[PDB]
Amino acid sequence: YDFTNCDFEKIKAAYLSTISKDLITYMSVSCSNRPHCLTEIQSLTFNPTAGCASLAKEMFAMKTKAALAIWCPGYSNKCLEQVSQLQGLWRRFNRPL
């Protein structure tokens, strides 16, 4: 799915208010622009990786799916390293234009 037509500001607000908190509490690469970043979050959150495959059902993953479904037309150890990369991608997504 191409994230070119998404509403990036509402997704960013949802992350900064809600998704980021769950993403940090779960702890207990880069991207060029906003669509590429969102592609990276989608792939790195909902597509299973080597070993850390159960990340798609986490609560922050539910939040990401909810935000993407609402604001993207037509959308609807190793784990710590993956979530750190996800935090980096989200942080670069929130970068001002």
Epitope: S17, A66, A69
Partner: antibody, heavy 121, light 109 residues
């Protein structure tokens, strides 16, 4: 305006099954999860589960495992909750709640009027 | 699961006074993951506060929320006639979602 209109009150015998409907209108149906919760008479709210209308991905409460089954019909924008093996304490008011973001915060932002399901012999 | 304890079970407050509803959480949860719902008898619950501090659309400035970790609080500066109802604190942090048993804001006379 967002409306979640539910079916009528149900009276079921113990051991039977009930299908509670919840038709959503006034917004994009496939983009928001429906949670189903229940309120026993005189008790607090009890989360039953949730379903994503986009692709039928359901998460049920552990105690309602194998007893509740959630389906959706995007043609009519309806969400169905099937509670089988009904017993005495399933008598409650069942609410369908659309959950969405308000200023970046995710919660059950819309609720249906509820259906009174009475499971008595 | 997360156990959501509400206090008191019922709160008898005279109209125009200050009301405080406490919600203890069995585990430390984010402020953004706890919300407050208001229900009046014979009506469905209504989303009242998002993320422990953010009033929804239409809720007046009397209501406020504050807390963190395992302790959260709903505060009404001047309780009015329409404020007497059952308030639930609901966490979102982990499945299954759990609600508080509900605090019934009640008229005192």
């Amino acid at each position: 305006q967002v409306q979640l209109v539910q079916s009528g009150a149900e009276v079921k015998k113990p051991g039977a099954s009930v299908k509670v409907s919840c038709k959503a209108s006034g917004y994009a149906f496939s983009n928001y999860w429906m949670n189903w919760v229940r309120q026993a008479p005189g008790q607090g709210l009890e989360w039953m589960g949730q379903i994503f209308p986009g692709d039928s991905d359901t998460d049920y409460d552990q105690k309602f495992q194998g007893r509740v089954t959630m389906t959706r019909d995007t043609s009519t924008s309806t969400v169905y909750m099937e509670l089988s093996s009904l017993r005495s304490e399933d008598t409650a008011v069942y609410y369908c709640a659309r959950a969405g973001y308000y200023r970046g915060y995710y919660a059950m932002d819309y609720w249906g009027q509820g259906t009174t399901v009475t499971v008595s012999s | 699961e997360i156990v959501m304890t509400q206090s008191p079970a019922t709160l008898s407050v005279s109209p125009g006074e200050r009301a405080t509803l406490s919600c203890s959480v069995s585990s430390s949860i984010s402020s953004s993951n706890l919300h407050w719902y208001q229900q009046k008898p014979g009506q469905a619950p209504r989303p009242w506060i998002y993320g422990t501090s953010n009033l929804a659309s239409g809720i007046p400035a009397r209501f406020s929320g504050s807390g963190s970790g395992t302790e959260f609080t709903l505060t009404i500066s001047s309780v009015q006639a329409e404020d007497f109802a059952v308030y639930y604190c609901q966490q979102w942090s982990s499945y299954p979602l759990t609600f508080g048993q509900g605090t019934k804001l009640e008229i005192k006379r």
